[PDB]
Design a protein around this ligand. Structure first.
Ligand SMILES: CC(C)n1ncc2c(=O)[nH]c([C@@H]3CN(Cc4ccccc4)C[C@H]3C)nc21
Ligand SMILES: CC(C)n1ncc2c(=O)[nH]c([C@@H]3CN(Cc4ccccc4)C[C@H]3C)nc21
Ligand SMILES: [Mg+2]
Ligand SMILES: [Mg+2]
Ligand SMILES: [Zn+2]
Ligand SMILES: [Zn+2]
Lengths: 328, 328
């Protein structure tokens, strides 16, 4: 719509607008454009303003983050961007600036961006069963998430990437603790525990109770992390195939090294349709249902697409099933 | 008593019987003799037998463990020997072989031996405040105990040191999980918490309830860890100066680096007597009282010597107070 053309890293006005919504097509963008988006979120949320973040430091920091994401089929830099972009979406959708401090929004955003740093593309169960250096390092306790987190603060300790350098020590310590809690909370082995605690608080929720608020931020980051299916189908569906790529890599290796294979990583047991129907019905919908009690607009903008997804996979399944009826 | 003289590393019959009581003078022995003592405990408790431990591997493992203790004034290989030797004493005293599986005995001993591996001589609070590599690696969560536990399994993963090599993977997993839980339980930041969970199980204890037993093993290790004052006074007391040496090393360093100093480590605020009075009264005694409810022989063997220590130290402090009052 502009009188001249601009480089891609100069986000257009339409892109800036689109970036606030969960319909943003995360696939359209190169790393450099994604980096620009993230940068813009920090400015637009008032976090550069309120935390006195050096604007060049913010950029050096994001570039460093990018460099410490690996090129995995799924647990890559585009995935962290989805998680961040969904968090951003949720701030707008759920009017989170009315409810949360700027420090809380900083924690949410920074944890979202950092939460899968240097992921190897094999999960905690692989680490633990194979007795990897990481499992040994972290005593079989959320080995990956502990590493993501440590890498995060390693990056922030480099003075040219330290977006928190103009924050007082107490604020730093507060932000550090919140980020650790949040990144640790993304270990899916703790999903039911965290949901139970949340739901328990939801018996009588209190926005001025720090404990309630901590659980609400753990639930937000968990929402954002596993939210691909909330997105328009054409955006959502490619992510399942990337995840299965990663998972098949792992179960191949596990077979070959004599380690236990998860059925949901077994090429002969999983299908995309059946895996997603299960995850949608039994993990995603129920989680977003609880959140919808606090944020009613979540039903229309995030539950609806999930219902639509579930239904469409049910259709796909009827067809995978017929295909298998031709194959023995 | 014998017809010829044997090398020190061949323990005499008398040392062997004496090794089973809390009364054993840990100060008399060289490292090689302490190593022979630990080796003997594994054979004597039936652990070599019941877990098919290669007797040479057991010694390589012990020697390696010894090497990875640092030459700290307190948190050294002799301390490790104390903690293990007290555990072994408690085995006999409390007839723990009636109550616990051999796997649990193994866990208890191996955790006692390993629980302070590669201690730097500066506590978790220093690590955290100074933002050390350990603190950043472990996300400020029990960084030292995490580290001790990691180093234990780094050692065991060296095949010449793997005393668990003839154990099937299910048993290994169970031993590892147990040792991790017990080593992490030695973080004194968690003391009141663990004591409280213990106490609530103790309301109706159940030796066949795995959670009850886990807590019990946690307390047992915690008992052995801080048990110096249960020992005869001449054995117990030189440990206090060793610990203060380490603490003063820390407060001096904090002072120099402009970091917070804990009053209990400050050479200006600390008295030996006042240090010990409170610790004995409010940490050691209450902890051993709850154990005595399950193991009533503990009163005479471990409480009585704590009562004496408390009395001795309350007397020293009067003499301190009469000196201070007498002067200023
Ligand atoms: C990384 C995992 C937790 N993840 N993140 C997003 C999604 C997704 O859309 N689908 C799946 C599938 C669900 N997995 C089976 C499963 C069912 C219920 C609870 C936990 C896992 C297998 C994935 C292909 N995993 C995701
Ligand atoms: C290393 C600590 C926990 N420890 N281990 C044995 C002993 C001991 O005999 N005395 C003390 C005293 C406790 N004091 C500080 C403190 C009190 C309460 C909680 C944690 C530390 C000073 C020590 C001389 N600490 C020991
Ligand atoms: Mg993750
Ligand atoms: Mg320790
Ligand atoms: Zn993730
Ligand atoms: Zn210790």
């Amino acid at each position: 719509g502009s009188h001249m053309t601009y480089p891609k890293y100069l986000l257009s006005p339409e892109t800036i607008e689109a970036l606030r919504k969960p319909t943003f097509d995360v696939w359209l963008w190169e790393p450099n454009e994604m980096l620009s988006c993230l940068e813009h979120m920090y400015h637009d949320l008032g976090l550069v303003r309120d935390f006195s973040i050096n604007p060049v430091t913010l950029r050096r920091w994001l570039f460093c983050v990018h460099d410490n994401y690996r090129n995995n089929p799924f647990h890559n830099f585009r995935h962290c961007f989805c998680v961040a972009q969904m968090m951003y979406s949720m701030v707008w959708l759920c009017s989170l600036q009315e409810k949360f401090s700027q420090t809380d929004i900083l924690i949410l955003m920074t944890a979202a961006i950092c939460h899968d740093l240097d992921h190897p593309g094999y999960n905690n169960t692989y680490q633990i069963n194979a007795r990897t250096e990481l499992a040994v390092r972290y005593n079989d306790i959320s080995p990956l998430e502990n590493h993501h987190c440590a890498v995060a603060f390693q990056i922030l300790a480099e003075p040219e990437c330290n977006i928190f350098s103009n924050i007082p020590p107490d604020g730093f310590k507060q932000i550090r603790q919140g980020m650790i809690t949040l990144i640790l909370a993304t270990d899916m082995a703790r999903h039911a525990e965290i949901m139970d605690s949340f739901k328990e608080k939801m018996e009588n929720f209190d926005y001025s109770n720090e404990e309630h608020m901590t659980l609400l931020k753990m639930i937000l980051i968990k929402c954002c992390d596993i939210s691909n299916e909330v997105r328009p189908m054409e955006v959502a569906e490619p992510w399942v195939d990337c995840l299965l790529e990663e998972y098949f890599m792992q179960s191949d290796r596990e077979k070959s090294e004599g380690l236990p294979v998860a059925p949901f990583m077994d090429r002969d047991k999983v299908t995309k349709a059946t895996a997603q129907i299960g995850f949608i019905k039994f993990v995603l919908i129920p989680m977003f249902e609880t959140v919808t009690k606090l944020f009613p607009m979540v039903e229309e903008i995030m539950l609806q697409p999930l219902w639509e997804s579930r239904d469409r996979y049910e259709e796909l399944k009827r067809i995978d099933d017929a295909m298998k009826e031709l194959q023995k």
